[PDB]
Design a protein around this ligand. Structure first.
Ligand SMILES: O=P(O)(O)OC[C@H]1O[C@H](O)[C@H](O)[C@@H]1O
Ligand SMILES: [Mn+2]
Ligand SMILES: [Mn+2]
Ligand SMILES: [Mn+2]
Length: 391
């Protein structure tokens, strides 16, 4: 192998400006990092800068450097959707024609009707809501009627809440599996179905650790699958395992925050493995992008950047670090949905003694998967062009 270990970091939703097809999605004007940099009166990200972030695009406080640490460019998304699953599945070598849907007005009557008809239960709620706020509003009614609280969030999810002493866990799990089947339908294509059991009484409800997530398998065998099948390590950190429904994953490390994600990254740097370590930093999307909070987003980016010098110190000559994003989620943009954006790509190894250069723009996110696959000598994905030889 050219590289023994590849550390792939997805800064979730950290887009670098509207994609050529942004208008189709109502994303004209969108610029995640650029709008954040403006809000912050200059983003402090000196380590991303040293890697060549400003060389991709200059933004407030983010300037180009004469000798970037590694190679740099941006990537264009080819798949129809702008969601996390689409982005990650494309990164690992797929092409996804069918987008996952978001439901700001709640779910279609048709879907809920069929869910009722299959389960023998009434559905209440049917709206975007915080999980905790909807229990306060409708938890008592749920308890008294044996109905199901169905709700959504800013991303492609269908969540079913039911009290554990009213609807038995196994019944809630069966109901969610039915929901999972019904939502494999392009009329209402949902990324995840999530069981949200809760306990307690009105004014004091608690969601339990019995939460279960029902994900779809990626629409194809990914580069992770091929790595796993050739006896390589695939270490998934954070939401990664869930995003791929465990496909091609050899070890999974749960994280609770971006900082904890960077701690697990460092943990993997300390591991003797050959293969891929794959981190998702999800806070950017989950806490700041959808909530349209440029200040919190800006601060999180600065907190993330400050962690990088330790990563740089631990990388070996035969390690490659790849930093990218899966889509945009501009926190100063109308509505609550992702934004169709280019994503940055930074590729760094300490073996790059003279620093890096600009790469041709990646025409699909799958160029990452192709690069990883060529590196480890496994079956090349159907889509994507490797940049391994450019490094
Ligand atoms: O905590 P809740 O409001 O029920 O759900 C919000 C999000 O929490 C989970 O990560 C899913 O991504 C949901 O979109
Ligand atoms: Mn938009
Ligand atoms: Mn994402
Ligand atoms: Mn999201």
């Amino acid at each position: 192998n050219k590289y023994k270990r590849i550390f792939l970091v997805v800064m979730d939703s950290v887009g670098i400006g509207e994609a050529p097809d942004a208008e189709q999605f109502g994303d004209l004007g969108s610029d995640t990092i650029g709008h954040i940099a403006e809000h912050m009166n200059g983003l402090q990200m000196p380590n991303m800068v040293k890697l060549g972030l400003g060389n991709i695009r200059e933004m407030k406080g983010i300037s180009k450097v004469e000798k970037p640490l590694g190679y740099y460019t941006k990537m264009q998304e080819k798949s129809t959707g702008k969601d996390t699953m689409t982005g990650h599945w494309e990164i690992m070598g797929l092409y996804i024609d069918t987008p996952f849907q978001v439901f700001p007005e709640g779910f279609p009557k048709e879907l809920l009707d069929e869910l009722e008809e299959k389960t023998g239960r009434k559905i209440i709620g049917n709206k975007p809501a915080s999980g905790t706020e909807i229990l306060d509003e409708l938890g008592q009614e749920q308890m008294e009627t044996g109905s199901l609280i169905v709700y959504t969030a800013a991303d492609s999810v269908l969540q079913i809440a039911a009290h554990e002493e009213v609807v038995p866990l196994d019944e809630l799990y069966k109901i969610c599996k039915i929901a999972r089947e019904l939502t494999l339908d392009e009329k209402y294509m949902v990324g995840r179905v999530i069981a949200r059991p809760f306990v307690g009484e009105p004014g004091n409800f608690t969601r339990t650790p019995n939460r279960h997530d029902y994900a779809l398998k990626p629409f194809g065998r990914t580069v992770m699958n091929e790595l796993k099948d050739s006896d390589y390590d695939v270490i998934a950190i954070g939401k990664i395992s869930d995003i791929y429904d465990g496909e091609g994953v050899t070890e999974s490390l749960r994280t609770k925050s971006n900082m904890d994600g960077m701690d697990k990254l460092v943990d993997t740097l300390n591991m003797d493995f050959t293969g891929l370590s794959f981190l998702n930093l999800v806070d950017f999307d989950a806490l700041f992008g959808h909530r349209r909070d440029p200040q919190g987003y800006g601060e999180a980016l600065q907190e993330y950047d400050a962690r990088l010098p330790e990563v740089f110190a631990k990388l070996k000559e035969d390690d490659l670090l790849l930093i990218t994003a899966d889509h945009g989620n501009d926190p100063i943009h109308p509505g609550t949905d992702h934004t169709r954006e280019y994503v940055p790509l930074l590729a760094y190894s300490p073996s790059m003694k003279e620093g890096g250069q600009e790469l041709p723009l990646r025409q699909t996110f799958a160029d990452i998967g192709a690069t990883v696959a060529e590196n480890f000598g496994v079956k090349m994905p159907e889509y994507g062009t490797s940049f391994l030889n450019e490094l």
